[PDB]
From a paper:
Bemnifosbuvir (AT-527) and AT-752 are guanosine analogues currently in clinical trials against several RNA viruses. Here, we show that these drugs require a minimal set of 5 cellular enzymes for activation to their common 5′-triphosphate AT-9010, with an obligate order of reactions. Crystal structures of human histidine triad nucleotide binding protein 1, adenosine deaminase-like protein 1, guanylate kinase 1, and nucleoside diphosphate kinase at 2.09, 2.44, 1.76, and 1.9 Å resolution, respectively, with cognate precursors of AT-9010 illuminate the activation pathway from the orally available bemnifosbuvir to AT-9010, pointing to key drug–protein contacts along the activation pathway.
NDPK is able to transfer a phosphate group from a triphosphate nucleoside donor to a nucleoside diphosphate acceptor, to yield the active triphosphate form of bemnifosbuvir AT-9010. The reaction proceeds through a so-called “ping-pong” mechanism in which a triphosphate nucleoside transfers covalently its γ-phosphate to the enzyme, and the diphosphate nucleoside acceptor is subsequently bound to the same site to accept the phosphate. NDPK shows a high conversion rate and is only 4-fold slower with AT-8500 as substrate than GDP (1,300 ± 100 nmol/min/nmol protein versus 5,400 ± 800, respectively). We crystallized the NDPK with AT-9010. A hexamer defines the asymmetric unit with 6 extra densities corresponding to 6 AT-8500 diphosphate. Interestingly, only the α and β-phosphates of the 5′-triphosphate moiety are visible. A new density is observed near the NE2 of His 118 of each monomer, which correspond to the histidine phosphorylated state His 118-P in Fig 3B (inset). The hydrogen bond between Lys 12 and the 3′-OH of the ribose is no longer present because of a displacement of the ribose, probably due to the 2′-C-methyl, 2′-F modification. This shift allows the 3′-OH to make direct contact with the phosphate group of His 118-P (3 Å).
Numbering used by the authors:
A (entry chain F), B (entry chain E), C (entry chain D), D (entry chain C), E (entry chain B), F (entry chain A): 6 to 156
The structure:
Amino acid sequence: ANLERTFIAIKPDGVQRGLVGEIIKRFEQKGFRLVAMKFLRASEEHLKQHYIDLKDRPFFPGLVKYMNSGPVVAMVWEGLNVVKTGRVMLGETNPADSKPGTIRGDFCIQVGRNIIHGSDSVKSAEKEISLWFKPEELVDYKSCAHDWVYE
Amino acid sequence: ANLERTFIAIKPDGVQRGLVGEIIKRFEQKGFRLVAMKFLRASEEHLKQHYIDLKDRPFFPGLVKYMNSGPVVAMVWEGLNVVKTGRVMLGETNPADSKPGTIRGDFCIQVGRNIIHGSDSVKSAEKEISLWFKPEELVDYKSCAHDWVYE
Amino acid sequence: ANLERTFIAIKPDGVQRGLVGEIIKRFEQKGFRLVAMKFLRASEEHLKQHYIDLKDRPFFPGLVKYMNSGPVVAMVWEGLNVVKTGRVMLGETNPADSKPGTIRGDFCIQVGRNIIHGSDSVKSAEKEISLWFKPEELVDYKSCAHDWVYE
Amino acid sequence: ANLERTFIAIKPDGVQRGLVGEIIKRFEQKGFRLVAMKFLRASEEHLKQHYIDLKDRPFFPGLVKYMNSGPVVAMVWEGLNVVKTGRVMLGETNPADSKPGTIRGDFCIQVGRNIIHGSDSVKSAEKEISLWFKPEELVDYKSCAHDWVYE
Amino acid sequence: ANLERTFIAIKPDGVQRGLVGEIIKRFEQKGFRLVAMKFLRASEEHLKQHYIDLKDRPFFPGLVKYMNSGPVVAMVWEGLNVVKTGRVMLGETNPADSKPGTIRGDFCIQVGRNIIHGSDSVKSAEKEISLWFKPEELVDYKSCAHDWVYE
Amino acid sequence: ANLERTFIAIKPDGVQRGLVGEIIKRFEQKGFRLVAMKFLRASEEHLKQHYIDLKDRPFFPGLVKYMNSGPVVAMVWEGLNVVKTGRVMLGETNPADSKPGTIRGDFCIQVGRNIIHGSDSVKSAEKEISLWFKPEELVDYKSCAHDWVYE
Ligand SMILES: C[C@@]1(F)[C@H](O)[C@@H](COP(=O)(O)OP(=O)(O)O)O[C@H]1n1cnc2c(=O)[nH]c(N)nc21
Ligand SMILES: C[C@@]1(F)[C@H](O)[C@@H](COP(=O)(O)OP(=O)(O)O)O[C@H]1n1cnc2c(=O)[nH]c(N)nc21
Ligand SMILES: C[C@@]1(F)[C@H](O)[C@@H](COP(=O)(O)OP(=O)(O)O)O[C@H]1n1cnc2c(=O)[nH]c(N)nc21
Ligand SMILES: C[C@@]1(F)[C@H](O)[C@@H](COP(=O)(O)OP(=O)(O)O)O[C@H]1n1cnc2c(=O)[nH]c(N)nc21
Ligand SMILES: C[C@@]1(F)[C@H](O)[C@@H](COP(=O)(O)OP(=O)(O)O)O[C@H]1n1cnc2c(=O)[nH]c(N)nc21
Ligand SMILES: C[C@@]1(F)[C@H](O)[C@@H](COP(=O)(O)OP(=O)(O)O)O[C@H]1n1cnc2c(=O)[nH]c(N)nc21
């Protein structure tokens, strides 16, 4: 259970507004383990694949353009219930509903510029991880505080 | 909609306990735009006008004296749903009910020393803004990150 | 009422992961007064007394070993509703249910390594205080900001 | 001597990059007392007065345009040796020479976008104070921690 | 050499202005190990012993009264060159000369309210440690990141 | 001049001690632009190339083993004088000499576990960038605050 992983991506507005370090620190101080990280401008084709479920929504063309309009930080994090807990830490998808203390609650305002993405389930995490990273980009190491984080 | 404004005042206890910077930083990092700001000791007459709706409450004389007992920082902030979101960020009026992560939940304890004020509605914001500021004190400028905060 | 006290202990995992300063800062910034503090490795006998109600639970031997496996910071804090508010600040006993903004929600993952303890009631605070501190270790002084924190 | 005052202005780049709360917090946590504060777009004529000594420098037209290109936060701060210490806290005028730990050393890069101004001497502070504030904007109150800051 | 220790005391002004958490966090994040900690009001006799070398200085009566005027946090910290490094982190004894980034440079103003004490040499550390703590209050444990801090 | 780049690597001790977010935030808040980033366990052969100049030093086998003993965060950052400024922000190579306010001064103790690397010159930056990154990993975009950071 402690080996669960999620995909977290800082979107272009999070990069542009200078929020990368603050976001990583939230995951680090919680006790989760950084498995993978890269910085890139995601191609339109890649983003169409990421967002394939939405390909018919009216806002899809604009979503893909915005997500391609600057670089993103793509990450994988590991730990117990990291998918669900990761989502709690992000806050609600819509920042208007996100509580103070959460990433979106603290740092952004509108649903179209909501700074971050996290996997919504284990099954979507495994799909997003295979889409965004090569197997060799997932680094295997053990946190020095593992036994103080986990029974 | 993105042009809504609220009035936020740091009460004398907020000033005295050295919380001005911390409070401003919360609004800045969220993406709201500072429109106006001044520091003053509000007269008793001014405060009776600010609090006119409470003039019959038992606590009103003591409320006015406390609000006159040191300086306050008066501000106007702008953004989408700034009134309602501003109140969420402050926390509940009574600090005992305010959640961790909010301004009152993090920083104060009792309802009579609750460090900050925010407008409860658009209509009361517009009245409080006209009471506390001259129209020329409201500054018009565009945040450099506006297009990363709003679609 | 403003003289209520609670017992807070930073558990060995809290110490080990470098969270002592962060935790104390949360209580200080809120307006509570530090009454007593010591750093020690609690003996097994002491811990069995602290946790006497659980002496029959399956996890009790392991709980005691963990709580003896490094030092703890034992504190007393004072203020209005410090017991209940202290527990809100800590978050739920189980970190999986603790909200962002709380100590456990921000800093830990698993119920067996949940970094901190706070008294659950006035009556249990008074018992824990007499167990962990001598009366002469409780310091009486008045915070310089007391009249800005309390009516 | 403990009554000395300085003028500090957060320049339009400081406001645009969201540094107002961070800067104020540095002065507050040091133990200085905020005496006055306002937020305005300074007129070109006002700025030419502020910068009268430089009116012949090649960079003066550009300096005045930049200082008028967005709002500034104008402040007065009080305490022992606040002029000299204020300058130390800001860092060197040229951010390339400012040490880490200082405001310019932490937050900016180039001399023409150096985020903040502080009075260079007691006599220039008193001139800048009279230029930017009316005497009634200077608030008299005593910090609750004064006797823990000063012998 | 990695087993060197220093005595650090947060003075009454440091406690009263709510700096305890901040100060501890500086030592923890650096990689030093907390060995002992207690909170007390030091007696005048104890303080006269601590400050015996200064008993003839004109400021001595004032120094002793102030150091007795509220509680102090007494600590022992361990690590390589902790005495010298500890002093660098504190800053110069006189806050006017302390650089931004240091404890005194960031948080206090005058030499008689200079928030913190650190041992000036290994020999004075060992004397201060035996004066303020019993040998049994010094806790022996190994930090989980020790081998990431030391070769 | 404003297009200069440096290579910054957070070493395995920096990762293990949970300093990645904190370090990135220092570069972001200064005004530098993140150009590239990846997370990997560098091979022994790669590290021997990075450290080719030291291959005869007594500490070289241990340095390579330590640098291979966990993952590193490799980055490229851009801005005016980023190589020299980068070095000033890191502090001296030897943490014993690094000032408070710097990354090494704040966060580490010993030369063999000094948490971070930065290029010592433009020429070594260009060599390190070509060794650690492919050209296509270097992302070109323009900061939204560019004209508030640079004249
Ligand atoms: C913000 C989102 F990226 C979500 O992060 C993602 C997943 O769609 P959902 O929100 O249904 O689901 P999750 O948040 O994953 O639980 O689509 C986007 N999105 C959703 N609604 C809207 C909308 O009105 N406008 C725009 N511009 N983007 C929208
Ligand atoms: C503290 C307040 F200034 C509130 O900030 C404001 C509006 O508080 P309300 O409850 O009317 O409504 P809102 O939540 O603002 O919409 O009155 C005051 N106030 C309310 N109860 C008390 C009380 O017991 N003691 C005192 N000293 N002041 C009180
Ligand atoms: C974490 C706890 F110390 C609680 O902090 C304390 C009192 O927990 P209680 O159930 O008495 O109630 P509170 O919510 O505290 O008032 O026992 C422990 N504890 C409870 N369940 C478990 C468990 O599964 N595993 C382990 N290792 N420890 C557990
Ligand atoms: C940056 C400043 F706004 C300083 O804040 C102010 C006082 O800087 P001065 O050198 O006059 O003197 P002090 O540091 O106070 O002793 O002038 C400006 N300034 C100085 N050099 C330059 C320059 O090259 N380019 C530009 N654009 N502006 C410059
Ligand atoms: C602040 C100090 F506690 C120093 O920490 C310690 C020894 O001061 P020294 O500088 O001799 O030695 P250190 O560098 O400190 O180790 O007495 C105090 N002290 C020094 N000067 C003064 C002064 O003017 N006024 C007052 N009120 N107290 C002073
Ligand atoms: C810390 C370093 F990685 C420096 O980054 C790099 C170049 O050390 P240099 O001083 O040649 O140059 P820089 O200051 O780096 O640009 O060697 C390493 N290093 C230097 N001395 C020692 C030492 O005693 N022990 C160990 N374990 N490693 C050492």
